[PDB]
Design an enzyme around this catalytic site. Structure first.
Site, PDB file in Angstrom:
ATOM      1  N   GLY A   1       0.814  -1.128  -0.083  1.00 25.03           N
ATOM      2  CA  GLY A   1       0.054   0.016  -0.014  1.00 25.03           C
ATOM      3  C   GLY A   1       0.810   1.282   0.075  1.00 25.03           C
ATOM      4  O   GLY A   1       0.451   2.454   0.162  1.00 25.03           O
ATOM      5  N   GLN A   2       2.153   1.230  -0.245  1.00 23.71           N
ATOM      6  CA  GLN A   2       3.228   2.287  -0.228  1.00 23.71           C
ATOM      7  C   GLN A   2       3.162   3.107  -1.640  1.00 23.71           C
ATOM      8  O   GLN A   2       2.557   2.517  -2.584  1.00 23.71           O
ATOM      9  CB  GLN A   2       4.633   1.799   0.060  1.00 23.71           C
ATOM     10  CG  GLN A   2       4.782   1.433   1.362  1.00 23.71           C
ATOM     11  CD  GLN A   2       3.905   0.408   1.795  1.00 23.71           C
ATOM     12  OE1 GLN A   2       3.670  -0.582   0.780  1.00 23.71           O
ATOM     13  NE2 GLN A   2       3.713   0.012   3.074  1.00 23.71           N
ATOM     14  N   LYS A   3       3.471   4.347  -1.539  1.00 25.31           N
ATOM     15  CA  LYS A   3       3.428   5.244  -2.675  1.00 25.31           C
ATOM     16  C   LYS A   3       3.914   4.733  -3.964  1.00 25.31           C
ATOM     17  O   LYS A   3       3.665   4.604  -5.121  1.00 25.31           O
ATOM     18  CB  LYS A   3       3.630   6.719  -2.554  1.00 25.31           C
ATOM     19  CG  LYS A   3       3.036   7.277  -1.190  1.00 25.31           C
ATOM     20  CD  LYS A   3       3.569   8.469  -0.777  1.00 25.31           C
ATOM     21  CE  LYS A   3       3.987   9.394  -1.658  1.00 25.31           C
ATOM     22  NZ  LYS A   3       4.846  10.542  -0.925  1.00 25.31           N
TER      23      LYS A   3
ATOM     24  N   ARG B   1       2.670   1.648  -5.643  1.00 23.39           N
ATOM     25  CA  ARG B   1       1.254   2.294  -6.192  1.00 23.39           C
ATOM     26  C   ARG B   1       1.265   2.327  -7.577  1.00 23.39           C
ATOM     27  O   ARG B   1       0.425   2.137  -8.293  1.00 23.39           O
ATOM     28  CB  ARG B   1       0.510   3.334  -5.528  1.00 23.39           C
ATOM     29  CG  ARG B   1      -0.530   3.024  -4.565  1.00 23.39           C
ATOM     30  CD  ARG B   1      -0.989   4.126  -3.846  1.00 23.39           C
ATOM     31  NE  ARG B   1      -0.104   4.320  -2.579  1.00 23.39           N
ATOM     32  CZ  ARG B   1      -0.374   5.165  -1.382  1.00 23.39           C
ATOM     33  NH1 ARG B   1      -1.521   5.784  -1.553  1.00 23.39           N
ATOM     34  NH2 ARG B   1       0.249   5.356  -0.630  1.00 23.39           N
TER      35      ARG B   1
END
Ligand SMILES: Nc1nc2c(ncn2[C@@H]2O[C@H](COP(=O)(O)OP(=O)(O)OP(=O)(O)O)[C@@H](O)[C@H]2O)c(=O)[nH]1
Ligand SMILES: Nc1nc2c(ncn2[C@@H]2O[C@H](COP(=O)(O)OP(=O)(O)O)[C@@H](O)[C@H]2O)c(=O)[nH]1
Ligand SMILES: [Mg+2]
Ligand SMILES: [Mg+2]
Lengths: 431, 184, 1122
Positions: free
Chosen positions: B69-71, B74
């Site tokens: 769920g990290q940028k 993503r």
């Protein structure tokens, strides 16, 4: 220019075909790259019989690979000589048959028969004068033998004026541990007795015994059986691949070796017998080679020609010898008043001479006999058919697909009639 | 290829469903997966990549994926939008500050050409938290009511206690089976 | 298979890798063992899903260790590959590792691979797929490299750069690694960073590969296929906004490559694939402004349906279906209309397969509009009946398969109300096909479509009822679908007339004879469910087809007419009414003109003559078995004639259909004589009875063989009322043929048929005690038994083999048919001597060497012995035979197998009356040529001799019987060599060890003289060898017999044939080495040296001296020239 389209079905058939192709590639003088580096004019004298003419003088085989699973199709594509074969010559499916004749002959077999006949026609159309068809397969498996019989029947229906050759392999308990190998062996024999012209019987029990005793191998594998099969095949087609004074025609050879349209089964042999790696031992004379080739030990079938009657015999020598020596030897062998008389060679052998021996040997000989002793093999599996059909063991695998017990009874009756005819003609007067 | 072979292939494909799990970081995307199989959750580490788990449930073979769920993780979600039969977006109920990031992530995922054919499952995780937003509140901050071209649904759950996850998975499987086949 | 029941074996095999990687024989054994274990689940590998992970991790902890040698790593990768072919890679790769610590360990392993190593191709294959399962990592390849400027002088190359240089090199190889290179790029270029970095470079490389490569140079074709596969995979698994920019240049290059005209099936398939991959990049994905390139793509994909191979047609259909699903609803109609053009009259059958595939693909998505129902359906009705003959082969299987596929895709293409108009034409099509289709694949293909239709929609008449019976397994046997399920389906009024029409139109006019016969037999039963329709509509139809110019159609129509007539007669026979109630005057009038319309067109010549004769004979039989009203009409005189001519021209019929022709003619004659040749109840016509009998009797003397063979069975089929006063002549005429005359030496089939004819005649007339020329009585019963026994000694041997055996078969089935009859009427006629002789002859014919005649004989013996109603009188040792062959064990006996027959037949020696014959029969097997038979017979004989070897009386009687058999067959070439070999074997085994005690036994004293008289002046090599062996085995008997055998062995040592000279010495050496008491130790080192040094194959004059010297040592008088 007579072209013969080669075919190979099943795992064993594909392996035997690949081995034979790799063996003859070194004899003809065509590097695995797809070019000819041979230094003999006799090599290219009849190369068109099994190779096509492409741009840049590149020779392409005429083989057609077929299967129901992809594993073996992938192994041959990456083999030592896997580049000469065309990529679009590989026809295969995913599930296989499952050592079941009904699943490999009526369902998946008839499903992939369309794609197989596509390539078969594509290859046949690229031939000036097509002579016949050859197939290499086994009789103890589902996919292999099923698709083999189906393709033979299809080629007979679409080309009734073409000869058919089948180097079928007979299974053996000492090589496989499958219980439904007798049923598939009986059905393929019934189909071949109806739609075949030549059938080179290659027993898997004689080869195992040879590899175990003669070669003195502790644990022989398929690599000690495939090499022998490929050597025998190369020795059989010596006249069809190189020149020769004797008539090297396939139709005439089959007509002379098929005096009976139901007894077309031929036992093949070859001396001297060698293993893998070690092949350059010594050079046997013509008498020794003739004595070894006609010996039950150098027979690819478990049957002994001596225990029967000689109907037709075809001998082919290769090395550095003249036809006069072979003729004198063959004429003195039958002379009952000579010092070289035997009791296992008829009074008429179609002898041939060649000047291109195989690799690792200076002289070699091959023999093909239509003796009645082969009937013994037909009785070896028949007994097993009685120890299963009577108990209806594994019958739900066949009846569930579509087959009827009426097909099994017909095949058994055909096998019994063939055995009876063989045993009856074995007692004919030798006039 | 024969009709019989074509049908044997259609059955094997329908017997295997695909569920892509996504959501903001630290939303319990791994805890729900570990609880749905009966594993341990106390020894869970923050995923630094992605995970896959092939389980069986109600006669269906679920190959559940779980991406970070990290940028920086993503920008790679597009690498898993193929043959996806269902999507499961996890949302932290106790998280009230980053409520627009999830609403922005789900909106961008709803306008995906490859994800148009799937069933949306909103797992409002971390319900036992004292400062956790109820299902009605989360159904108003993520703009779920506006959705019409997707069979969406929102149910509160708690991965630590394994509550309300089985009903949600059952509803998702039923909505996926209600259809016949999917697009290529 | 429910679970993997070979876990321990596989675990042990995997663990043995660490101590079998240095072996070459054990390595292959383990590989072949792992292959055969994994191939068992090739049809359902999903059962192995629970095991995949553990085995994968095992193979991984061997290739993921730093102390692992290359050879050990290569076996693990071969195993890994074996698990990826059975489960497949798409499903087995999801479990492989995918941690960020597996990106450099896998790329570094990929950089130590030998591309020129063909033996390690599995290693490279497993390497590329692993590297591709590691490109899913959700991170940039830059974060992994770290710092590239750490190595001064030479900077390290980036991970992404290395992968681009690995894929480009493996995409031009000739092994299977190129396919692993296609799966790698699909997961390498389809990510963000690689997309922005190397997409343009890879595209330029591909456009350069497809701009320089050819379909003629081998490596050029290798470069073409790989590039096309890579492009297709990229366009399939690639984003549509990063790809659409390049779709314009890719198609422009593919158009210039010229793939359709190239001579490669794989290249064209990949090209069509790439064309359909680019086609969807222009449209938007839908969930149920048109650039110019879409038109060109459609024009290419609509030309890929008329391909010459099905692999390309399927791809073209898939592409058309995927394109139609994305285009608007307006262009869909135009696409459907353009695809429908494939079914034109000028288009070949290959174009129909692609058209049907495209139609099915379109219907699967639900794009076909209602307006396209009246047309599309109208085509399907034909595609289900596509079955043509193109020269010598047949075509129409794939067409029917695609038609069934299209039918199966219509259960979701239209609403129940949208397809409500065609449920009467499509339900009749599906059912009709699933019932009469030739191929089993099509039948089950039509069965699945009907099931899907009745499940989803459920508007077909009697859907559940037709599905429950005609299920997937019920339609497996074709015979069951034509004679059983067909009647069940016709039971309803909605599947009666259409099926009968389809059968009478196409199936009756089929090219296969078996299919025509099956259709006729099916119509036979179908006529019951519709007698009026079959008598008023089908009979005129078939009657008009009997006058067709087509031969096969004429035969089929004749068979259908005969079957319908038989069915109508059977149906009418229930209500006790004539058959004329169904057929009209015009119908019975046309059944009396079929044969006169064939004979007047000369339709009985050529290859079709036999088929026409068979059809007309079947029709005549079916008409005579119905009692039709043709009595008195001249038409009868015609039918009879057509039979005689057949029996006169049987040699003209092919050898593969003469027996069936003869049987059908005999059956027709029997049915005709017992219907149209009866003057009064119990009497017959005097004129016909006389003329037919005289003609048949005079025909028996025709030198032609097939004529006699046919007329024999003809006589053997006449009724009983026609032989009320002519049996004394028919029996004599039949017996005159059973005799072997100087001219009729090789005429065995004639006697074989005469015996069968005598059996049938004896069975029909029965027994009436007092009436010789009417029935079998005590006056004409002895002659019959004598004629039947005189054909049991038929051992005629010619260039055709032992054809006489055939006659013997006719003697076993005939003699039985007579005996069983007498016991069922006048058992007193069965004399004791005759029964004993018959039993002894059956015993001898059941102890033979051939396996099919021996098995027939044992069955006849068991049937004659197991007769209790009433028990056959005068049976020697009846109780003994019954105890030896209990009824419980007879239920499972392999008489054809020598192993399961010789040990049961050798026990008959215990009975005196059988001891002689049984041994005379077993001698042929004990001295034949078959190896297995010889071994089994010798073993069974020794197993019985062991029980009577220590008995001077039993052994003496056995030796006496053997010598009597030998004397009776003196100078007989068929019994001399076999019996000599049997004696040699018995002597080598040491059975007669008791007679060797005394000197000069009455046994050997005459056996030696008999052997001498047998071998006196013999040129046969086999006979000479047998005699030498017998004389070298008989030395064990002391006395004058030993000295005479030694003198004979010395005489034979100097024979004309050097081979015999050498064999005699070779056998004498073994004989001397065996028996030591024959020669003392004072002259034993003097015989072996002379035998080993002397060359018995050299000059005979020189060997005479050495041979004479061996006569002065053995003490044998030295012979001279008389
Ligand atoms: N001599 C020899 N026999 C082989 C070889 N491979 C298989 N066999 C025999 O072939 C028989 C059947 O196996 P295969 O021919 O491999 O099977 P298939 O024909 O592909 O059939 P399916 O397994 O049903 O797909 C068995 O009796 C094996 O012993 C081989 O390389 N050499
Ligand atoms: N109180 C509470 N804590 C939870 C729940 N689910 C997960 N957590 C904790 O939240 C943290 C984030 O979990 P993790 O699964 O690693 O988040 P992810 O990596 O995005 O999937 C972990 O320490 C979990 O134990 C829940 O339902 N209630
Ligand atoms: Mg196989
Ligand atoms: Mg996580």
């Amino acid at each position: 220019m007579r072209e013969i389209v080669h075919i190979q079905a099943g795992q064993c058939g594909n392996q035997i075909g690949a081995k034979f192709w790799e063996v003859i590639s070194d004899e003809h003088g065509i590097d695995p790259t797809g070019t000819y580096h041979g230094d003999s004019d006799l090599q290219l004298d009849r190369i068109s019989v099994y190779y096509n003419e492409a741009t840049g003088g590149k020779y392409v085989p005429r083989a057609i690979l077929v299967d129901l699973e992809p594993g073996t199709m992938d192994s041959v594509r990456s083999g030592p000589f896997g580049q000469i074969f065309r990529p679009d010559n590989f026809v295969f499916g995913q599930s296989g048959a499952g050592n079941n004749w009904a699943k490999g002959h009526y369902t998946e077999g008839a499903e992939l028969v369309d794609s197989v006949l596509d390539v078969v026609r594509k290859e046949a159309e690229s031939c000036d004068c097509l002579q016949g068809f050859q197939l290499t397969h086994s009789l103890g498996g589902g996919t292999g033998s099923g698709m083999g019989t189906l393709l033979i029947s299809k080629i007979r229906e679409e080309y009734p004026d073409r000869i058919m050759n089948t180097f079928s392999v007979v299974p053996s308990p000492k090589v496989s541990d499958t219980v439904v190998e007798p049923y598939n062996a009986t059905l393929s024999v019934h189909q071949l007795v109806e739609n075949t012209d030549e059938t080179y019987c290659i027993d898997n029990e004689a080869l195992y015994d040879i590899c175990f005793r003669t070669l003195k191998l502790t644990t022989p594998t398929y690599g000690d059986l495939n090499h022998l099969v490929s050597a025998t095949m190369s020795g059989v087609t010596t006249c069809l691949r190189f020149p020769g004074q004797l008539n090297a025609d396939l139709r005439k050879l089959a007509v002379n070796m098929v005096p009976f349209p139901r007894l077309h089964f031929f036992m093949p042999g070859f001396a001297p017998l060698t293993s893998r790696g070690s092949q350059q031992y010594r050079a046997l004379t013509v008498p020794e080679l003739t004595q070894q080739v006609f010996d039950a030990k150098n027979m690819m079938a478990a049957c002994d020609p001596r225990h029967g009657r000689y109907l037709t015999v075809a001998a082919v020598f290769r090395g550095r010898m003249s036809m006069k020596e072979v003729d004198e030897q063959m004429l003195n062998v039958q002379n009952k008043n000579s010092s070289y008389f035997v009791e296992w060679i008829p009074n008429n052998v179609k002898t041939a001479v060649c000047d291109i021996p195989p690799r690792g040997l200076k002289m070699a000989v091959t023999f093909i006999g239509n003796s009645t002793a082969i009937q013994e093999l037909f009785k070896r599996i028949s007994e097993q058919f009685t120890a299963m059909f009577r108990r209806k063991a594994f019958l739900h695998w066949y009846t569930g697909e579509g087959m009827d017990e009426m097909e099994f009874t017909e095949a058994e009756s055909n096998m019994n009639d063939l055995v009876s005819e063989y045993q009856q003609y074995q007692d004919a007067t030798a006039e | 290829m024969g009709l019989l072979t074509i049908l044997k292939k259609m059955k094997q494909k329908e017997r295997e469903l695909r569920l892509l799990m996504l959501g903001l970081d630290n939303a319990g995307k791994t805890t729900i997966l570990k609880k749905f199989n009966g594993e341990d959750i106390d020894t869970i580490s923050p995923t630094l990549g992605f995970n896959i788990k092939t389980l069986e449930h109600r006669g269906f073979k679920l190959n559940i994926w779980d991406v970070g769920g990290q940028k920086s993780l993503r920008s790679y979600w597009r690498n898993y939008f193929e043959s996806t039969d269902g999507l499961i977006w996890v949302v932290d109920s106790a998280d009230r500050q980053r409520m627009q990031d999830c609403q922005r992530e789900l909106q961008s995922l709803l306008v995906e050409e490859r994800l148009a054919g799937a069933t949306l499952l909103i797992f409002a995780n971390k319900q036992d938290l004292p400062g956790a937003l109820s299902s009605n509140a989360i159904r108003e901050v993520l703009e779920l009511d506006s959705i019409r071209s997707h069979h969406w649904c929102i149910q509160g759950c708690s991965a630590v206690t394994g509550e309300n996850l089985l009903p949600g998975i059952d509803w998702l499987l039923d909505d996926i089976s209600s259809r016949i086949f999917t697009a290529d | 298979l429910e679970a993997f029941g070979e876990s321990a074996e596989t675990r042990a095999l995997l663990g043995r890798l660490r101590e079998v990687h240095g072996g070459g024989a054990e390595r292959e054994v383990a590989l072949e063992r792992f292959r055969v274990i994994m191939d068992k689940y090739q049809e359902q590998p999903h059962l192995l899903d629970p095991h995949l992970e553990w085995m994968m991790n095992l193979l991984l902890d061997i290739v993921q260790d730093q102390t692992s040698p290359a050879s050990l790593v290569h076996l693990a990768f071969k195993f890994l590959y074996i698990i990826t072919k059975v489960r497949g890679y798409k499903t087995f790769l999801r479990l492989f590792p995918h941690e960020v610590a597996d990106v450099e360990p896998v790329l570094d392993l990929v950089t130590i691979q030998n591309p020129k190593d063909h033996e390690a191709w599995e290693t490279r294959y497993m390497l590329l797929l692993w590297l591709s399962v590691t490109c899913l990592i959700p991170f940039d390849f830059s974060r992994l490299d770290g710092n590239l400027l750490t190595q001064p002088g030479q900077a390290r190359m980036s991970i992404m750069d290395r992968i681009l240089q690995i894929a480009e090199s493996y995409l031009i190889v000739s092994d299977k690694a190129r396919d692993a290179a296609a799966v790698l790029v699909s997961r390498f270029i389809t990510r963000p960073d690689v997309k922005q970095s190397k997409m343009a470079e890879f595209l330029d490389w591909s456009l350069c590969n497809l701009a320089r490569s050819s379909f003629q140079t081998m490596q050029g074709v290798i470069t073409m296929d790989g590039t096309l596969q890579a492009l297709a995979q990229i366009f399939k698994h690639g984003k549509r906004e990063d790809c659409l920019p390049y779709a314009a240049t890719v198609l422009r290059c593919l158009d210039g490559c010229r793939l359709p005209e190239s001579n490669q099936t794989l290249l064209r398939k990949l090209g069509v694939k790439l064309v359909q991959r680019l086609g969807l990049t222009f449209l938007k994905p839908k969930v149920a402004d048109v650039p110019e390139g879409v038109e060109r793509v459609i024009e290419q994909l609509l030309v890929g349906l008329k391909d010459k191979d099905t692999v390309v047609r399927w791809s073209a259909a898939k592409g058309i279906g995927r394109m139609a699903g994305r285009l608007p609803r307006a262009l869909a109609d135009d696409v459907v209309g353009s695809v429908l053009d494939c079914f034109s009259f000028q288009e070949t059958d290959k174009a129909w397969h692609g058209g049907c595939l495209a139609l099915a693909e379109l219907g699967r998505r639900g794009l076909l509009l209602p307006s396209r129902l009246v047309d599309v359906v109208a085509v399907i009705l034909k595609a289900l009946t596509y079955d043509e003959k193109r020269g010598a082969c047949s075509v129409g299987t794939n067409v029917r398969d695609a038609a069934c596929y299209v039918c199966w895709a219509f259960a979701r293409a239209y609403e129940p109300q949208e397809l409500k108009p065609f449920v009467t034409a499509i339900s009749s099509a599906l059912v009709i096909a699933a019932v009469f289709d030739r191929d089993i694949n099509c039948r089950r293909a039509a069965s699945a479509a009907f099931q899907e239709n009745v499940g989803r929609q459920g508007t077909f008449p009697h859907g559940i009822d037709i599905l429950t019976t005609a299920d997937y397994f019920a339609v497996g046997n074709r015979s069951n679908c034509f004679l059983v399920i067909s009647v069940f389906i016709a039971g309803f009024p909605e599947y009666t007339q259409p099926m009968i029409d389809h059968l009478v139109t196409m199936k009756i006019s089929h090219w296969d004879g078996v299919i025509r016969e099956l259709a006729a037999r099916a119509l036979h039963n179908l006529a019951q469910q519709a007698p009026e329709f079959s008598a008023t509509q089908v009979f005129p139809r078939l009657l008009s087809m009997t006058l067709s110019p087509d031969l096969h159609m004429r035969h089929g129509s004749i068979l259908a007419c005969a079957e319908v007539a038989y069915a109508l007669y059977k149906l009418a026979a229930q209500e006790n009414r004539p058959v004329t109630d169904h057929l009209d005057e015009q119908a019975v009038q046309g059944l009396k003109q079929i044969h006169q319309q064939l004979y007047d067109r000369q339709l009985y010549r050529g290859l079709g003559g036999q088929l026409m004769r068979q059809a007309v004979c079947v029709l005549i039989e079916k008409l005579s078995l119905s009692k039709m009203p043709f009595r008195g009409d001249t038409v009868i005189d015609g039918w009879q004639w057509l039979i005689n001519d057949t029996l006169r021209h049987l040699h003209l019929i092919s050898s593969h259909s003469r027996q069936q022709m003869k049987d059908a003619a005999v059956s027709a004659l029997a049915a005709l004589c017992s219907e149209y040749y009866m003057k009064e109840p119990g009497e017959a016509d005097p004129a016909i009875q006389e003329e037919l009998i005289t003609q048949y009797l005079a025909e028996l003397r025709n030198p032609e063989e097939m004529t006699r063979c046919g007329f024999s069975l003809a006589l053997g089929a006449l009724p009983g009322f026609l032989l009320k006063g002519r049996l004394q002549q028919v029996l004599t005429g039949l017996r005159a043929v059973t005799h072997t005359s100087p001219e009729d030496v090789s005429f065995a089939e004639s006697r074989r048929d005469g015996l069968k004819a005598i059996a049938r005649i004896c069975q029909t007339v029965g027994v009436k005690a007092g009436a010789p020329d009417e029935a079998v009585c005590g006056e004409n019963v002895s002659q019959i038994y004598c004629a039947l026994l005189g054909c049991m000694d038929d051992y005629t041997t010619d260039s055709r083999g032992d054809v006489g055996t055939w006659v013997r078969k006719a003697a076993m089935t005939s003699l039985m048919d007579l005996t069983l009859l007498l016991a069922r009427s006048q058992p007193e006629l069965i004399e004791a001597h005759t029964c004993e002789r018959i039993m002894c002859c059956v015993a001898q014919q059941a102890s033979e060497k051939i396996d099919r005649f021996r098995a027939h004989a044992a069955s006849v013996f068991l049937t004659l012995l197991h007769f209790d109603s009433p028990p056959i009188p005068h049976v020697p040792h009846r109780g003994e035979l019954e105890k030896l062959f209990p009824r419980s064990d007879v239920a499972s006996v392999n008489w054809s197998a020598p192993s399961q027959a010789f040990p049961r037949i050798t026990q008959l020696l215990g009975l005196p009356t059988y001891r002689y014959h049984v041994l005379l029969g077993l001698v042929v097997s004990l001295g034949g040529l078959t190896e297995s038979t010889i071994r089994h017979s010798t073993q069974s004989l020794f197993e019985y001799m062991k029980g009577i070897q220590s008995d001077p009386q039993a052994l003496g009687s056995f030796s006496g019987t053997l010598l009597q058999i030998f004397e009776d067959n003196l100078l007989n070439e068929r019994v001399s060599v076999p019996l000599l070999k049997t004696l040699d074997h018995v002597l080598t085994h040491g059975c007669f060890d008791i007679f060797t005690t005394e000197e000069d036994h009455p046994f050997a004293v005459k056996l030696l003289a008999l052997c001498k008289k047998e071998i006196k002046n013999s040129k046969d090599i086999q006979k000479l060898l047998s005699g030498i062996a017998v004389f070298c085995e008989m030395v064990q008997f002391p006395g004058d017999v030993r000295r005479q055998a030694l003198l004979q062995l010395c005489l034979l040592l100097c024979h004309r044939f050097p081979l015999i000279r050498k064999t005699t010495a070779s056998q004498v050496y073994e004989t001397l080495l065996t028996y030591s008491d024959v020669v003392g130790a004072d002259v034993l080192d003097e015989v072996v040296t002379v035998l080993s040094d002397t060359a018995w194959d050299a000059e005979l004059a020189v060997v005479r001296e050495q041979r004479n010297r061996l006569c002065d040592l053995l003490g044998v008088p030295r012979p001279q020239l008389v």
